[PDB]
Design a protein around this ligand. Structure first.
Ligand code: NA
Length: 244
């Protein structure tokens, strides 16, 4: 689904869901297919969505990195290996020699790949004893991330990781205190007409009670989106938010 922020804004207005702040620019939706890349493709599909956001917001960066406009998963395997070979992620050598096809990837690989593309990546680690506290801190940070009063084009989507699954956060809904998300493992519940608000919510909204995890990893791009060199970003350094 191409340019899915324009249509999603219309659906939010149609269902009367107020208080939504979404990422700037636009984004394409990428999804896994059951019996093909379902169960390991989610992280790769989420990287594809983040690439599409960069594509809409800086075409020059996109032309420079994807000369044929091709960022299929095979292109991403080259970029991930390239980042490891350039010294990004101190522990990246531990995955040299693996098959990159079929490989589950996480926030560290998301950081490594985009850092190798000279993208300025922020990584936030939510690590709590209390499950309620973890979602409280996460939801507040994400809510503040998407809040913007001035006309900007640098509010990026977020990659959210929990328990091996990952999704893209494209906004926050303050009337419901829910994440607005693009989940690559829920293609079956998108490719049809939404008539009831309940089906829309199950697809695009994540309440705190739907994310009963005590650990989250969050990746997004910074206000200064692009780097001149990643020599200072070789080590994966996250900011840790915790109650212990
Ligand atoms: Na803005």
């Amino acid at each position: 689904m191409s340019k899915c922020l324009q249509q999603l804004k219309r659906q939010l207005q149609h269902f009367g869901i107020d208080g939504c702040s979404l990422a700037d620019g636009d984004i394409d939706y990428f999804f896994t297919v059951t019996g093909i890349d379902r169960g390991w493709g989610c992280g790769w599909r989420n990287i594809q969505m983040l690439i599409s956001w960069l594509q809409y917001t800086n075409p020059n960066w996109f032309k420079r990195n994807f000369s044929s406009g091709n960022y299929e998963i095979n292109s991403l395997q080259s970029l991930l290996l390239s980042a490891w070979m350039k010294g990004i992620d101190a522990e990246g050598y531990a995955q040299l020699g693996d098959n990159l096809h079929g490989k589950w990837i996480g926030a560290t690989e998301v950081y490594s790949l985009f850092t190798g593309l000279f993208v300025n990546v922020a990584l936030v680690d939510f690590d709590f004893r209390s499950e309620a506290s973890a979602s409280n801190a996460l939801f507040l940070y994400v809510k503040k991330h998407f809040e913007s009063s001035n006309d900007t084009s640098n509010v990026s989507p977020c990659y959210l990781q929990f328990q091996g699954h990952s999704i893209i956060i494209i906004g926050f809904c303050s009337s419901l205190e829910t994440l607005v998300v693009l989940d690559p493992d829920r293609y079956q519940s998108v490719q049809k007409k939404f008539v009831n608000i309940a089906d829309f919510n199950h697809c695009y909204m994540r309440k705190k009670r739907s994310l009963k995890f005590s650990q989250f990893q969050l990746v997004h791009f910074k206000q200064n989106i692009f780097l001149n060199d990643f020599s200072s970003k070789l080590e994966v350094r996250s900011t840790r938010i915790s109650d212990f």
